[PDB]
Amino acid sequence: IVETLNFLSSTKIKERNNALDELTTILPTKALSTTAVELLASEHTKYCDLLRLSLSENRLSTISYVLRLFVEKSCERLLLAVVPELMVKDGSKLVDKICEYFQSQMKLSMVTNFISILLNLLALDTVGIFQVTRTITWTVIDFLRLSKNTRLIMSLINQLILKCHCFSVIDTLMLIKEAWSYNLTIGCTSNELVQDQLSLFDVMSSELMNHKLPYMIGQENYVEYREYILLRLSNYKPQLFTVNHVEFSYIRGSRDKNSWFAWLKILGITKSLLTYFALNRKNENYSLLFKRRKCDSDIPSILTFLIHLLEENSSFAEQLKELLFNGDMARLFKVCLPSCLLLANSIKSDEKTINQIYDLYELSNESFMLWGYLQYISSADRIFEWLKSKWNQFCNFISWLGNWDESHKIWQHFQEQRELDLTRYNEILYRLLENINLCGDSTFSEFIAAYKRTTLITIRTINVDHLVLDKINMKEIVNDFIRMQKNKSQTGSTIDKAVRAYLLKQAIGEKSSYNKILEEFTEVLGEKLLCNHYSSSNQAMLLLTSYIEASDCNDILDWIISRFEDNSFTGVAPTVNLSMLLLSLLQNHDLSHGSIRGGKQRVFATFIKCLQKLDSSNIINIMNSISSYMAQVSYKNQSIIFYEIKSLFGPPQQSIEKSAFYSLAMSMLSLVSYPSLVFSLEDMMTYSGFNHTRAFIQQALNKITVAFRY
């Protein structure tokens, strides 16, 4: 049977792309379904169904995020996308869908890893269906189920670490978008956080750092028609230990980190295992505790900066944040314990204290910091020689500056490092700079190894991969334009050289390169998933902007690039950003009416925007020329845009920001009159208060424009 042959082709999943081509060629309704890794699975499932019409559509939409194992839809990666979401909901049994979904998702049926993941997805949005979403979130947060992985909870923490309501209404949306961008640092930031967290003491971080932040927010919240549900939740939170108990158990890891991190006698004290005592205290309190959570022996000048930092927190932590979004005795103990630098930073027998530092240097940036504080001297001379031996993170010689034996030591270090050996030499040279007559000798020795018109390693993949790319990192020190070169190679001081290669001749040379790139991009139609590369419109606009910035000929070139962007008919994020960029060029203007069209496109390309609205306002405020024409038109255009009202108060906040963009010429008063007409509780007033603050004495303190308001 031809059907059997088709089945064999599908079964033969090796070189699946060939099988896919065969299926495409094959493209009897039951067989049509049967003809369909994942592709092989599609063939098998459809064939079973064929062997056995709404059901086919239902099967196609079945088990999407709720996959059999995997269906490439855990977080769902046009009209079809909106329809699919609706179908999925129907099977489970576009803002409107988002609201239905926020509520339906919390409703579930039952009500655990799935919850942390859904929450993470919702938090990333920095939006969702306002209050409907917030009510859904409260219920979902409460339904902890089989609570403790931590990283998913931490992703959810992007929102849960800000467990509050109505504190920044018609404001928080812009802040949330900015937070999402910061949250996006995760991946590389997570790896860095894990390394730093473990290096400083014994903390894990590893993208779970924000889960701890969410727990802190939860404690703070506990101590504090959708609205009725939210009010009830606010009270329930006092003791609604929705995975709080899980956190209490998970916290054993935090206790371990704190112990690792650990006036020495007071520091040595466990403060009666205060971290555990605090948890016990909270458990005993049962509800709305926090406050004095067993903070026994909470720092003392038992003989400071750390205490101030601890209060602020009530640095490896910075890495975690990026992912989230008798002197001799003291010196010997501080070095032997290796936070030697912290002890030294707070504190500053000197010869012996320096000898301990000297040994620490030999052991080889905390060491430099410790020395710098200590150095705030024969003692230093001894350490300098040891430091030279140590030379042959970092900072090193920086300590001497941060604070002629030191110079003699520098000469010894330079010669020893100068003698990849180049990496050692590179590090020594950086130290020489870090500290910025034997010092001249040190420079000469480092220079002698460097030689100049020389290299010490020890076009595609010949540009650096064949040779040099390893060296680029292997003997790296300090900083160079070479970093840009490496980034350019990865994207695929060479980056500077490439610009130099083009060096209006540069524009023409660059234009030729751009033309080649443009042709490839044009060839690459719908280059994304099983959808389209919407960003291409934005890329075309970016190219246009550079050419226009140039010069009339470049602007002519810009028009062609812009014309491609102008097609729009693409996801709004790309089409609208492209229109906005075009409008920014229009704002600068030139010697053509074309600027008017670009501005119209940006105006047409409406979005809630939030943080982007603010950015747009900041740009809008920079232009509208003057007279009583461009200024007037801009005001009219803004006035005619968002109605706010509804439950769209953020638009009113945006209007207020616009109202603040000049006054008593600018019709800030008209904007104010509109705000007065719209009795948006005191939300409008709060926004006005912010504008008033910008003006110093304003509003009741100096209405001023009251003369016209009257």
XYZ file of C-alpha atoms in Angstrom:
710
model
C 0.000 0.000 0.000
C 1.190 3.530 -0.709
C 0.172 4.217 2.851
C 2.467 1.430 3.994
C 5.306 2.899 2.013
C 4.618 6.261 3.622
C 4.586 4.669 7.023
C 7.933 3.038 6.302
C 9.379 6.383 5.278
C 8.145 7.874 8.541
C 9.378 4.893 10.578
C 12.759 5.439 9.018
C 13.474 8.349 11.326
C 17.195 8.286 10.641
C 18.013 11.336 8.550
C 14.563 12.528 9.603
C 14.796 15.619 7.469
C 14.722 13.335 4.402
C 11.681 11.620 5.811
C 10.136 15.071 6.363
C 10.740 15.945 2.753
C 9.088 12.699 1.734
C 6.082 13.490 3.930
C 5.875 16.940 2.433
C 5.874 15.404 -1.009
C 3.199 12.913 0.056
C 0.996 15.705 1.362
C -7.857 9.576 2.152
C -8.195 11.945 5.061
C -7.279 9.253 7.515
C -4.114 8.620 5.529
C -3.512 12.343 5.316
C -3.288 12.380 9.066
C -1.173 9.216 9.175
C 1.351 10.661 6.785
C 2.438 13.115 9.490
C 11.880 12.440 16.995
C 8.922 14.742 17.452
C 8.139 14.366 13.769
C 8.293 10.617 14.071
C 6.016 10.891 17.044
C 3.622 12.990 14.981
C 3.566 10.286 12.358
C 2.903 7.543 14.897
C 0.182 9.314 16.804
C -1.621 10.409 13.702
C -1.349 6.962 12.192
C -2.826 5.318 15.234
C -5.703 7.762 15.083
C -6.125 7.115 11.372
C -6.216 3.347 11.943
C -8.826 3.641 14.669
C -12.778 15.504 12.839
C -12.836 17.739 15.854
C -10.855 15.035 17.590
C -7.943 15.588 15.229
C -7.838 19.242 16.045
C -8.147 18.361 19.711
C -5.349 15.876 19.474
C -3.145 18.454 17.749
C -3.650 20.855 20.632
C -3.499 18.113 23.245
C -0.819 17.910 25.841
C 0.949 21.098 24.812
C 2.448 22.549 27.950
C 1.022 19.483 29.731
C 3.134 17.241 27.547
C 3.188 13.424 27.370
C 6.885 13.854 28.063
C 7.713 16.869 25.966
C 5.726 18.676 23.247
C 7.955 21.710 22.781
C 5.362 23.880 24.529
C 6.136 24.122 28.284
C 5.719 27.875 28.152
C 4.295 28.021 24.603
C 7.555 29.346 23.107
C -0.514 35.039 14.812
C -4.280 34.627 14.995
C -3.456 30.970 15.159
C -1.427 31.460 18.352
C -4.338 33.112 20.070
C -6.663 30.411 18.792
C -4.332 27.712 20.045
C -4.333 29.145 23.544
C -8.116 29.146 23.517
C -8.203 25.624 22.181
C -5.812 24.521 24.885
C -8.047 25.974 27.526
C -11.055 24.287 25.970
C -9.207 20.977 25.921
C -8.134 21.362 29.539
C -11.769 21.771 30.351
C -5.158 38.611 23.182
C -5.438 40.329 26.528
C -8.837 38.704 27.053
C -7.252 35.284 26.899
C -4.529 36.333 29.274
C -7.126 37.262 31.856
C -9.075 34.072 31.348
C -5.852 32.122 31.609
C -4.572 33.825 34.708
C -7.733 32.899 36.516
C -8.037 29.461 35.006
C -4.443 28.605 35.808
C -4.874 29.446 39.463
C -8.201 27.605 39.473
C -6.606 24.478 38.147
C -8.802 21.620 39.453
C -6.429 20.251 41.968
C -4.712 22.803 44.325
C 4.041 21.057 42.433
C 7.049 22.005 40.352
C 4.538 23.133 37.764
C 3.314 25.880 40.050
C 6.780 27.295 40.534
C 7.287 27.220 36.784
C 3.975 28.871 35.955
C 4.685 31.538 38.527
C 8.089 32.080 37.011
C 6.457 32.545 33.656
C 3.962 34.985 35.078
C 6.647 36.943 36.919
C 8.729 37.293 33.740
C 5.783 38.921 32.023
C 5.978 42.034 34.263
C 2.391 42.640 33.224
C -0.400 40.058 32.961
C -4.100 40.902 33.456
C -3.728 43.514 36.203
C -6.029 42.790 39.152
C -7.393 39.589 37.675
C -3.875 38.324 37.526
C -3.058 39.565 40.991
C -6.015 37.734 42.517
C -5.075 34.606 40.650
C -1.522 34.988 41.874
C -2.553 35.234 45.491
C -4.488 32.004 45.262
C -1.744 30.239 43.399
C 0.871 31.355 45.894
C -1.282 30.079 48.709
C -1.717 26.687 47.064
C 1.828 25.580 47.888
C 1.062 21.843 47.568
C 4.213 19.648 47.621
C 6.585 22.503 48.271
C 10.320 21.823 48.579
C 13.583 23.479 41.821
C 14.636 26.367 44.077
C 15.722 28.157 40.898
C 12.113 27.933 39.565
C 10.877 29.391 42.811
C 13.577 32.038 42.451
C 12.405 32.848 38.973
C 8.877 33.265 40.443
C 10.566 35.486 43.062
C 11.068 38.130 40.440
C 7.463 38.961 41.367
C 7.105 37.164 44.761
C 10.000 39.155 46.273
C 7.665 42.144 45.805
C 4.614 40.653 47.521
C 2.538 43.796 47.811
C -0.498 45.502 46.351
C -1.675 49.069 45.617
C 1.672 50.529 46.793
C 2.702 51.738 43.311
C -0.416 51.425 41.230
C -0.143 53.071 37.802
C 3.634 53.063 38.286
C 4.811 49.554 39.118
C 4.277 48.386 35.558
C 7.192 50.488 34.356
C 9.298 49.314 37.251
C 8.328 45.696 36.573
C 9.428 45.877 32.959
C 12.802 47.193 34.047
C 13.018 44.394 36.598
C 12.291 41.808 33.897
C 15.182 43.144 31.866
C 17.428 42.828 34.907
C 16.044 39.339 35.629
C 17.057 38.401 32.070
C 20.698 38.498 33.257
C 20.101 34.973 34.570
C 22.100 32.184 32.960
C 25.542 33.748 32.917
C 24.592 35.646 36.070
C 23.443 32.418 37.689
C 26.749 30.707 37.078
C 28.591 33.717 38.459
C 26.352 33.826 41.501
C 26.986 30.173 42.242
C 30.714 30.672 42.100
C 30.741 33.795 44.195
C 28.299 32.413 46.755
C 30.401 29.374 47.391
C 33.687 31.288 47.265
C 32.810 33.829 49.962
C 31.423 31.306 52.478
C 29.252 28.337 51.560
C 26.125 29.729 49.945
C 24.603 28.076 46.911
C 22.925 30.871 44.983
C 22.940 29.080 41.570
C 19.797 30.973 40.591
C 18.046 30.013 43.845
C 19.155 33.253 45.445
C 15.920 34.997 44.701
C 13.960 32.159 46.316
C 15.529 33.355 49.551
C 14.529 36.893 48.596
C 10.934 35.749 48.080
C 10.980 34.110 51.488
C 12.130 37.415 53.024
C 9.315 39.210 51.239
C 6.851 36.612 52.454
C 7.902 37.200 56.049
C 7.501 40.931 55.545
C 4.072 40.401 54.004
C 3.035 38.173 56.902
C 4.011 40.921 59.314
C 1.944 43.489 57.390
C -14.661 41.649 44.157
C -11.070 40.632 43.593
C -10.146 43.208 46.191
C -12.030 41.334 48.893
C -10.138 38.177 48.100
C -6.896 40.103 48.201
C -7.745 41.676 51.551
C -8.496 38.277 52.969
C -5.200 36.986 51.630
C -3.368 39.877 53.249
C -4.637 38.702 56.606
C -4.210 34.976 55.875
C -0.565 35.694 55.056
C 0.144 36.309 58.689
C 0.189 32.512 59.171
C -0.568 31.087 55.751
C 2.700 29.174 55.568
C 2.417 28.582 51.842
C 5.752 26.858 51.317
C 7.080 28.878 54.223
C 7.463 25.642 56.115
C 9.367 24.287 53.143
C 11.581 27.347 53.327
C 12.140 26.742 57.024
C 13.540 23.298 56.211
C 15.448 24.433 53.105
C 16.979 27.100 55.347
C 19.272 24.523 56.935
C 21.487 25.287 53.908
C 21.507 28.987 54.869
C 22.594 28.118 58.357
C 25.494 26.213 56.826
C 26.413 29.189 54.642
C 26.303 31.508 57.635
C 28.553 29.210 59.632
C 31.030 29.141 56.790
C 31.015 32.948 56.642
C 31.820 33.150 60.336
C 36.189 40.978 68.618
C 36.804 37.408 67.636
C 35.274 35.973 70.799
C 31.892 37.517 70.002
C 32.167 36.423 66.406
C 33.142 32.929 67.572
C 29.982 32.708 69.605
C 27.144 30.952 67.831
C 24.748 33.451 69.373
C 22.945 30.352 70.617
C 22.626 29.172 67.016
C 20.679 32.374 66.412
C 19.651 31.434 62.889
C 17.846 28.367 64.263
C 16.571 30.246 67.234
C 15.041 32.808 64.878
C 13.186 30.151 62.959
C 11.990 28.627 66.199
C 10.895 32.031 67.392
C 8.889 32.579 64.253
C 7.292 29.173 64.549
C 6.393 29.815 68.168
C 5.018 33.254 67.297
C 2.909 31.495 64.649
C 1.723 34.699 63.004
C 3.008 38.124 61.904
C 6.341 37.746 63.732
C 9.545 39.045 62.107
C 10.741 41.880 64.345
C 13.091 40.526 67.049
C 13.657 37.148 65.466
C 16.169 35.860 68.052
C 18.936 38.266 67.052
C 21.173 37.272 69.944
C 24.586 38.918 70.139
C 23.761 40.902 66.984
C 27.231 42.417 66.547
C 29.332 44.250 69.086
C 32.494 46.316 69.218
C 33.928 43.619 71.454
C 37.421 44.478 70.293
C 30.955 47.990 62.414
C 31.104 48.333 58.631
C 29.759 44.827 58.364
C 27.042 45.653 60.864
C 25.994 48.623 58.736
C 25.883 46.380 55.683
C 23.856 43.812 57.599
C 21.353 46.465 58.587
C 21.088 47.590 54.960
C 20.450 43.976 53.953
C 17.711 43.594 56.565
C 30.281 41.093 47.588
C 29.128 37.615 46.620
C 25.686 38.956 47.311
C 26.097 41.360 44.398
C 26.653 38.403 42.108
C 23.529 36.850 43.558
C 21.680 40.135 42.999
C 22.604 40.145 39.346
C 21.031 36.697 38.967
C 17.963 37.755 41.028
C 17.622 40.904 38.885
C 48.649 43.519 69.060
C 48.451 44.097 65.343
C 50.542 41.005 64.764
C 48.089 38.753 66.521
C 45.279 40.189 64.502
C 47.200 39.847 61.258
C 48.144 36.277 61.943
C 44.608 35.307 62.880
C 43.098 37.176 59.944
C 45.496 35.576 57.488
C 45.332 32.107 59.067
C 41.562 32.215 58.826
C 41.721 32.761 55.088
C 37.952 37.521 55.159
C 41.378 38.745 56.195
C 40.673 41.906 54.267
C 37.504 42.611 56.213
C 39.374 42.449 59.473
C 42.087 44.682 58.052
C 39.633 47.120 56.496
C 37.966 47.654 59.841
C 41.188 47.631 61.919
C 43.479 49.734 59.702
C 53.837 44.924 66.145
C 53.692 46.179 62.582
C 56.759 44.197 61.497
C 55.213 40.972 62.625
C 51.821 41.941 61.251
C 53.473 42.574 57.885
C 55.304 39.258 58.123
C 51.914 37.495 58.368
C 50.775 39.505 55.314
C 54.011 38.611 53.569
C 53.323 34.933 54.070
C 49.780 35.436 52.783
C 51.131 37.085 49.650
C 53.574 34.232 49.109
C 50.635 31.825 49.327
C 49.006 33.442 46.270
C 42.370 40.716 45.387
C 41.510 40.416 49.018
C 45.181 40.125 49.829
C 45.825 43.575 48.355
C 42.886 45.004 50.177
C 44.139 43.597 53.446
C 47.562 45.036 52.786
C 46.171 48.417 51.721
C 44.316 48.832 54.919
C 47.318 47.630 56.917
C 49.555 50.019 54.980
C 47.226 52.967 55.643
C 58.250 51.253 57.056
C 60.563 48.276 57.541
C 57.474 46.184 57.971
C 56.293 47.080 54.498
C 59.693 46.529 52.987
C 59.693 42.937 54.215
C 56.286 42.334 52.793
C 57.238 43.976 49.515
C 60.000 41.486 48.909
C 57.673 38.611 49.671
C 55.066 40.179 47.417
C 57.585 40.286 44.623
C 58.279 36.599 45.106
C 54.537 35.989 45.091
C 54.139 37.880 41.809
C 56.849 35.674 40.419
C 41.807 38.668 41.985
C 45.281 40.138 41.609
C 45.400 43.917 42.433
C 48.601 43.113 44.279
C 50.799 46.255 44.018
C 47.611 48.231 44.162
C 47.978 47.957 47.907
C 51.097 50.125 47.876
C 49.127 52.872 46.201
C 45.895 52.213 48.092
C 47.754 52.346 51.418
C 62.531 52.386 48.028
C 62.110 48.749 48.955
C 58.750 48.658 47.227
C 60.369 49.764 43.997
C 63.158 47.232 44.347
C 60.519 44.624 44.934
C 58.694 45.746 41.825
C 61.864 45.318 39.814
C 62.320 41.813 41.119
C 58.728 40.932 40.382
C 58.841 42.320 36.911
C 61.987 40.523 36.051
C 60.780 37.248 37.450
C 57.398 37.451 35.714
C 58.850 38.849 32.479
C 61.250 35.936 32.314
C 52.073 31.310 28.821
C 54.974 33.040 30.568
C 53.515 36.071 28.868
C 50.433 35.689 31.039
C 52.525 35.980 34.151
C 54.236 38.938 32.643
C 50.872 40.422 31.667
C 49.662 40.050 35.228
C 52.793 41.738 36.579
C 52.344 44.617 34.144
C 48.770 45.044 35.309
C 50.017 45.185 38.909
C 52.492 47.859 37.941
C 49.563 49.828 36.574
C 47.449 48.906 39.613
C 49.952 50.661 41.857
C 49.884 53.775 39.677
C 63.711 54.385 40.633
C 63.758 50.619 40.560
C 60.158 51.024 39.447
C 61.534 52.250 36.092
C 63.647 49.120 36.045
C 60.515 47.081 36.687
C 58.837 48.693 33.725
C 61.846 48.073 31.526
C 61.932 44.365 32.430
C 58.265 43.922 31.667
C 58.748 45.854 28.441
C 61.728 43.704 27.469
C 59.647 40.554 27.601
C 56.791 42.271 25.807
C 59.441 43.274 23.228
C 56.912 44.995 20.868
C 56.428 43.800 17.299
C 56.152 40.451 19.081
C 53.553 38.020 20.372
C 53.510 35.040 22.692
C 50.600 32.721 22.035
C 51.974 30.235 24.526
C 38.936 34.183 7.725
C 36.422 32.083 9.632
C 38.205 29.585 11.925
C 41.549 31.110 11.096
C 40.602 34.576 12.215
C 41.545 33.468 15.710
C 40.463 29.859 16.186
C 43.496 28.392 14.365
C 45.793 30.489 16.517
C 45.424 33.529 18.849
C 41.944 32.886 20.192
C 43.346 30.859 23.065
C 45.994 33.494 23.712
C 43.344 36.171 23.807
C 42.256 34.837 27.161
C 45.388 32.941 28.211
C 47.551 35.993 28.573
C 44.828 38.524 29.241
C 45.362 41.170 31.900
C 43.992 44.613 32.669
C 41.842 45.639 29.668
C 41.960 46.088 25.903
C 39.885 46.640 22.716
C 40.683 42.987 22.086
C 37.632 42.285 24.248
C 35.464 43.801 21.493
C 37.241 41.684 18.965
C 36.404 38.581 20.913
C 32.766 39.603 21.165
C 32.602 40.213 17.428
C 34.085 36.798 16.750
C 31.598 35.172 19.075
C 28.684 37.006 17.436
C 29.667 35.574 14.065
C 41.231 44.674 18.598
C 39.948 43.123 15.404
C 36.592 44.788 15.962
C 38.407 48.131 15.686
C 40.380 46.878 12.736
C 37.166 45.895 10.983
C 35.906 49.422 11.459
C 39.278 50.667 10.238
C 38.956 48.473 7.172
C 35.872 50.417 6.232
C 37.408 53.777 7.323
C 32.302 59.301 3.488
C 34.588 56.521 2.333
C 33.867 54.616 5.515
C 30.173 54.904 4.855
C 30.576 53.600 1.323
C 32.737 50.696 2.420
C 30.397 49.913 5.248
C 27.450 50.280 2.864
C 28.908 47.645 0.623
C 29.279 45.290 3.581
C 25.779 46.128 4.722
C 24.424 45.464 1.255
C 25.835 41.977 1.342
C 24.348 41.438 4.787
C 21.030 42.872 3.643
C 20.851 40.465 0.761
C 21.400 37.508 3.090
C 18.749 38.805 5.432
C 16.375 39.223 2.491
C 17.090 35.655 1.440
C 16.398 34.481 5.002
C 12.608 34.709 4.832
C 10.586 33.772 7.926
C 13.801 32.784 9.681
C 12.415 31.709 13.030
C 10.988 28.489 14.510
C 7.872 27.766 12.452
C 6.934 31.445 12.501
C 8.924 34.512 11.414
C 11.888 36.685 12.278
C 9.869 39.785 13.195
C 13.047 41.462 14.502
C 14.207 41.859 10.924
C 12.006 44.954 10.689
C 13.860 46.429 13.637
C 17.207 45.491 12.165
C 16.313 47.270 8.936
C 15.318 50.326 10.931
C 18.606 50.215 12.851
C 20.530 50.193 9.593
C 18.473 53.087 8.333
C 19.200 55.113 11.420
C 22.948 54.801 11.072
C 22.838 55.834 7.452
C 20.561 58.748 8.183
C 22.812 59.816 11.074
C 25.705 60.111 8.641
C 25.237 62.902 3.949
C 21.997 63.121 2.008
C 23.027 60.064 0.007
C 23.288 58.016 3.179
C 19.877 59.216 4.167
C 18.698 58.048 0.739
C 20.174 54.650 1.609
C 18.409 54.886 4.959
C 15.098 55.289 3.227
C 15.515 51.968 1.498
C 16.387 50.193 4.724
C 13.510 51.955 6.429
C 11.167 50.957 3.632
C 11.831 47.333 4.481
C 11.104 48.058 8.165
C 7.959 49.946 7.065
C 6.377 46.759 5.872
C 5.518 46.097 9.505
C 3.016 43.220 9.414
C 5.165 41.756 12.136
C 5.010 41.225 15.826
C 4.409 44.633 17.337
C 7.432 44.596 19.533
C 9.592 44.764 16.418
C 7.277 46.817 14.235
C 6.613 49.392 16.949
C 10.212 49.659 18.038
C 11.128 50.210 14.409
C 8.480 52.924 14.083
C 9.711 54.561 17.272
C 13.274 54.573 15.987
C 12.056 56.156 12.785
C 10.234 58.767 14.790
C 13.372 59.449 16.821
C 15.140 60.233 13.550
C 12.144 62.374 12.575
C 12.451 64.268 15.824
C 16.023 65.166 14.938
C 14.592 65.978 11.493
C 16.463 67.052 8.370
C 15.273 68.761 5.179
C 12.277 66.668 4.115
C 8.593 66.038 4.966
C 9.405 62.335 5.396
C 9.957 62.941 9.101
C 6.210 63.521 9.421
C 5.452 60.051 8.104
C 7.865 58.425 10.504
C 6.239 60.161 13.415
C 2.805 59.121 12.172
C 3.956 55.526 12.036
C 5.115 55.635 15.643
C 1.832 57.196 16.637
C -0.080 54.498 14.774
C 2.055 51.846 16.453
C 0.205 52.015 19.751
C 1.050 49.873 22.784
C 0.443 49.989 26.546
C 4.225 50.312 26.601
C 4.610 51.241 30.347
C 8.382 51.661 30.728
C 8.496 52.090 27.015
C 5.814 54.776 27.229
C 8.054 56.652 29.563
C 10.941 56.260 27.165
C 8.731 57.490 24.368
C 7.694 60.461 26.464
C 11.322 61.242 27.232
C 12.025 61.307 23.526
C 8.850 63.229 22.706
C 9.807 65.855 25.238
C 13.042 66.417 23.387
C 11.298 67.705 20.288
C 7.945 69.007 18.958
C 10.003 71.998 17.789
C 8.086 75.053 18.930
C 6.053 77.866 17.363
C 2.499 77.075 18.354
C 2.371 74.387 15.764
C 4.647 71.480 16.343
C 4.220 72.004 20.061
C 0.466 72.147 19.583
C 0.298 69.121 17.362
C 2.268 67.043 19.791
C -0.060 67.964 22.591
C -3.098 67.143 20.501
C -1.662 63.819 19.458
C -0.990 62.815 23.020
C -4.367 64.088 24.191
C -6.170 61.975 21.657
C -4.354 58.769 22.576
C -5.132 56.893 25.793
C -8.461 57.375 27.580
C -7.231 55.831 30.800
C -10.498 55.558 32.704
C -11.524 51.892 32.670
C -8.963 50.302 34.934
C -6.249 51.837 32.819
C -4.931 54.337 35.354
C -1.359 53.833 34.164
C -2.364 55.859 31.104
C -3.298 58.728 33.385
C 0.105 58.455 35.004
C 1.624 58.645 31.560
C -0.501 61.680 30.811
C 0.811 63.348 33.938
C 4.366 62.693 32.911
C 3.518 64.286 29.586
C 1.840 67.229 31.396
C 5.102 67.810 33.236
C 7.017 68.158 29.931
C 7.112 71.998 29.991
C 4.371 74.385 31.076
C 3.094 77.979 30.790
C 3.650 77.841 27.068
C 3.166 74.217 26.732
C -0.464 73.664 27.593
C 0.277 71.791 30.771
C -2.850 73.483 32.004
C -4.940 71.801 29.322
C -3.525 68.526 30.392
C -4.240 69.501 33.975
C -7.796 70.473 33.054
C -8.290 67.054 31.507
C -6.910 65.467 34.644
C -9.288 67.543 36.707
C -12.205 66.465 34.537
C -11.293 62.822 35.062
C -11.927 62.272 38.764
C -9.520 59.361 39.097
C -9.738 59.315 42.850
C -6.479 60.822 44.022
C -4.450 58.739 41.608
C -4.298 61.689 39.320
C -3.376 63.809 42.289
C -0.540 61.509 43.263
C 0.836 61.717 39.749
C 0.477 65.481 39.890
C 2.291 65.469 43.199
C 5.266 63.821 41.555
C 5.299 66.496 38.869
C 4.963 69.086 41.576
C 7.931 67.605 43.374
C 10.019 67.939 40.229
C 9.137 71.636 40.202
C 10.020 72.100 43.924
C 7.421 74.577 45.087
C 4.344 73.664 43.119
C 0.626 72.843 43.345
C -0.583 73.893 46.768
C 2.937 75.150 47.473
C 2.871 77.264 44.263
C 0.009 76.591 41.913
C 1.376 79.490 39.723
C -0.568 78.565 36.570
C -3.663 78.984 38.651
C -3.924 82.331 36.950
C -4.964 80.481 33.777
C -6.667 77.519 35.499
C -9.053 80.013 36.919
